RNA sequence: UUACU
């Protein structure tokens, strides 16, 4: 198959051994509405609607 | 075919069939002259270019290949470079162009007759050109050169680098090579007279810098870059122009530290693990700016612009402080070819040891007592530099004289008088008055103190030898300019010795008396490594410039008083031939002579320090017997370590005293002086440490040193060891591979491959890429190792060629007139360069049957009987254990030639040339001069130390020669029958035993496996969970904690899943080799140490009886004792392993530290050593195969054998 | 032809 050259496998121990933090989440902005994320599915696919 | 298009060429590893064509190309391109002239010069390759690559970094750098015309044809002789003064006594006075200058072969002829000054120098000169040239460490010069461009084409892969064509332009002729050497007739003799004078030792710098480009220091387009600087130096004297580079190019990096600025670095503790890192931001202070300007105009015109722009762009591109570490090592090998810098030294007389006067006069002492004659007796000092010494020094006195006192020291001058040598003398004609055997014997200290033993007593002995004259021995350095040391004679070197003794005793009381360096590994730094890590400290290492000169006689007599001031208080009856008696002493400010007790020492040391003559007697060939202007430190004595270490300590831990004394602080830690490297650490502000750095300078200066100038935040060097950040820089240029001009201890052996394996582990730390650098060890331990040379007889050299021919070709020679020995050579196959006996090299990856092949080993591979492992490891050690079988393939290990090595390392041919050197001297002859030597002595009862060497082995078993005392005395003796030669009466009687071992072994050989292994067949089964990664290779990810250990490289992960370095094993070897002769690497063989635990762990009740079989002190007694019982958590006796502390730098010693690596189910636990014993089972299958760890957990699986063979 | 730590 692949398999990637020891070098840069062991490498891949030291990387998931010693993580680290990003991604700040701040942008952040006035808005004057409903600050809509995720939507919602119904809950009883019951009616069909001719 | 050929090399480049090899199947080992492209793997890069050993299918069975690749093997055979590696034995085929390299023995026939080792033993012709033309197949050799084939490989380096086919009309093939083209002439190589504008080239362009990435000089060992991520930038690109392009160099075009230029040859100066100096080179291509020289000038004429010119003779006005070598001149006279207006007598020919010596030549002229402030001459440059003191080394060899490039002339081009033809143009030295002599014309005139055999006399009249100047034949007799251009008779010399001539060997300068044909002798002094060569130094070729292991093989002639051409097959070393092939050895690189052998190992740069299988590397590599193609033939297209840059070197082999300085390999073209520099020679070639079109018929054969430019020159040879005869080894018979010891000269190199020339085929082209046109060819430049300078270019056998073009030679080795092509071999240098391709050993450069192997390590990975240097890469393809850098090497461009590197070898039109050297031929640049070679326009008008390769050297002289090499000596003023050598400073410049290598003192940069301090600018390019400075500007990278803030540098992210590990940190280390007190006790040497690495705690943490910090980004501790590296600009140099303002008083080391100024130092910039002034040097950077130096670097615009000494050097060569090309080599130049090398530098400023090293300067301005670096990043980080891997990226200047990178570039330092590049620059430092574009200074360096490792050749040793050899002339006649006639004309290094005037550079070397002749004495300057630096600018102060020293003053000398207020002579307080005097004897008889008007002579410095007891003496103080008034209000000078050497006051500063004396108000630290002084009051040591009171306390050296109960050390000083309580030696007795004719007993410490019989132990000191060992390590044979020569006296001066040539005996004279009583050399035939004390015998014919000891004729030839009388070279050795210990056998010219014998010749003389009745004259020991008088104080006549002393007083004819003031009248011989000192004769210069010279050796040389691998950058240092030739230099030239005082052999003294034994009574010259007898006044001496007790200022030997005094000096010695201020190493045990004061730490900062400094390191010596028997760890070899990383203790020998540990205590750099942690100042430099710290915050607000200045480093300061300082050299002066030169230390033999400097020291007028004024200046001498610092240590002069000290030696002094302790002997009056101590109590020494006799010492030697004296007695203490009752002297008339003058006692300044008294009239008239009131008679005090003196002690022999008092008389001894007064009267060296009174007598003193310094000048070194060189007799010439040119000249009539050149001597050298007195007034320098004869640097043979036997003080000239301590006089220069006990000097300057007196000199900067005194200034703290005097800046102590009118209202200044001191500001200075912990100081290092191994003289004359003295190197000081200093803490406070910038401005503080500053106003002290300069008055340890001024000091120094005021006391006639010409100190160079060293300082910096956050640079340290000491013992040719630099050390940076928290980093350890290599230095890899000073081991040179191929250069050694020794003329004493020759290898053209088993002991040549020791030579190879103790310098291929010098360079495994110093190294950007060690896998490379075992590329380059096996062919030169294939190409040039590969033929031992034999003179048999006629009669039997017809059936040494039928039986050796059997199993591995042997070369038959061309038959002799009227010396009755042919010579023949035996080829010694390839597998003998892995034997465990033979040449103990660790291996590329073999073929199995099917064959699934074994694991490559690294560089990191222990030796001893681990590679008898190997042998086993090609007949599939994982298959083995299926069958429950300790059978042997005999095809596989007949078809590579394994069988046809060991049956060479059973002919047992070194110490059989041993046996007849042994055979022969009559030992009635030794005993009447040996026990005239325990006259001088003890006096009895070096009698009780045979006795208890004797009493131990006929009791139980053999505690072997070298180490017990008497023996001892013996064996010191026994080192001149094995100089004084192997001539051709006793070399027919080696032939005629030999052959008689032949025939024996030959008749039928399969491979002797013995009962006492099982003791391998153990194998690791990979599993599919990882191990932890030990924090402190978090740590050491950044930034570059030495060469190898770069970030995702075998050696930081060894570093990482090994892991650690103790300090509780190597402070008691520390310790151990304090009793035992320590300055250097003292790897870990040490014959006491593993003769005394295999008594101590199994046997010991006898161990009170082999002590004095040492005649070890109680307090000697006391070292040992706690390295045994340390000794006892690991490891085994029964499995022998060896590895160096130069070979493992910062990797751990103890195989405790890889049982945290491997699982070992617990019903293999099966006798009481044999949780000790897997330890090393562990310890060492992770650093041979560390190239193939993913950073898996490797598990132990066992031959059932294996579990009966401890089991008992 | 060849030193000491
Ligand atoms: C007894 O015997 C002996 C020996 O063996 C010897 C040695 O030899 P070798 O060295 O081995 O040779 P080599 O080196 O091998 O060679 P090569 O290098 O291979 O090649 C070669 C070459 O060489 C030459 N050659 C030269 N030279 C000079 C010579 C030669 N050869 C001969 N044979 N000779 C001479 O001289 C060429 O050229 C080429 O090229 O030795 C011996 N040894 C010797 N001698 C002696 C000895 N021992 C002791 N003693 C003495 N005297
Ligand atoms: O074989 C050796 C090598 C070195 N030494 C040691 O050499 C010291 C004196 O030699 P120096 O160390 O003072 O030479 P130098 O540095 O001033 O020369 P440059 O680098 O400036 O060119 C002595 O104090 C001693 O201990 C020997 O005694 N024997
Ligand atoms: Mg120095
Ligand atoms: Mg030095």
Redesign the interface.
Known sequence: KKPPT??????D??NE??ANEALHPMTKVIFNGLDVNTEVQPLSDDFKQI | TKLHNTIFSETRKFTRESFKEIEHLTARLANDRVARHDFLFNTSIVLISDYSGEDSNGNQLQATITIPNEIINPKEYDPSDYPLAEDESFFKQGHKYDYLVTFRAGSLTNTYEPKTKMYKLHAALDKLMHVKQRKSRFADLWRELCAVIASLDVWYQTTNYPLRTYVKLLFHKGDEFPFYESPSQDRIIFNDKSVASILPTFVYTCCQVGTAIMSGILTHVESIVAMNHFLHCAKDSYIDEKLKIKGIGRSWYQEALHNVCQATVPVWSQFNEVIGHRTKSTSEPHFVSSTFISLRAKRAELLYPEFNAYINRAIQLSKTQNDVANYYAACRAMTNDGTFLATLTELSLDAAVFPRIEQHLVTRPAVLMSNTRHESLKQKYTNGVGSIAQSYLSSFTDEIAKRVNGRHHDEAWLNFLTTSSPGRKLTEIEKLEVGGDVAAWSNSRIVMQAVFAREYRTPERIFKSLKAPIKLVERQQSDRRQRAISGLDNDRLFLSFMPYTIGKQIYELNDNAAQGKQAGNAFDIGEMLYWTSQRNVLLSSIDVAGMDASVTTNTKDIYNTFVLDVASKCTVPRFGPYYAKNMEVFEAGNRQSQVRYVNAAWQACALEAANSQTSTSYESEIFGQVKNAEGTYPSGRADTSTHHTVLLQGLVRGNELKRASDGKNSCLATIKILGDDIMEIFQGSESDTYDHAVSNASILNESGFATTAELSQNSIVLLQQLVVNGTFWGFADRISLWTREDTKDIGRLNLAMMELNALIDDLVFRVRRPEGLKMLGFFCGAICLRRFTLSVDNKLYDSTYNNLSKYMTLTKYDKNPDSDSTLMSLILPLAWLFMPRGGEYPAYPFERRDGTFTEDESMFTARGAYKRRLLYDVSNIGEMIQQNSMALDDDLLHEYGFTGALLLIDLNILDLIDEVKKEDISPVKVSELATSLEQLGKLGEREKSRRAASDLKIRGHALSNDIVYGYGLQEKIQKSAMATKETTVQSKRVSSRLHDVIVAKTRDYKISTIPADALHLHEFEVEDVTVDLLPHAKHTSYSSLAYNMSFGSDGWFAFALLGGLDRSANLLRLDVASIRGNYHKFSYDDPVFKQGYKIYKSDATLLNDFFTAISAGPKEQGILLRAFAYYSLYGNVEYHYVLSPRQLFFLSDNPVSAERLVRIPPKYYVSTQCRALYNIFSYLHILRSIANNRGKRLKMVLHPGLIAYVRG
């Open positions: 020891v070098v840069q496998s062991r490498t121990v030291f051994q010693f």
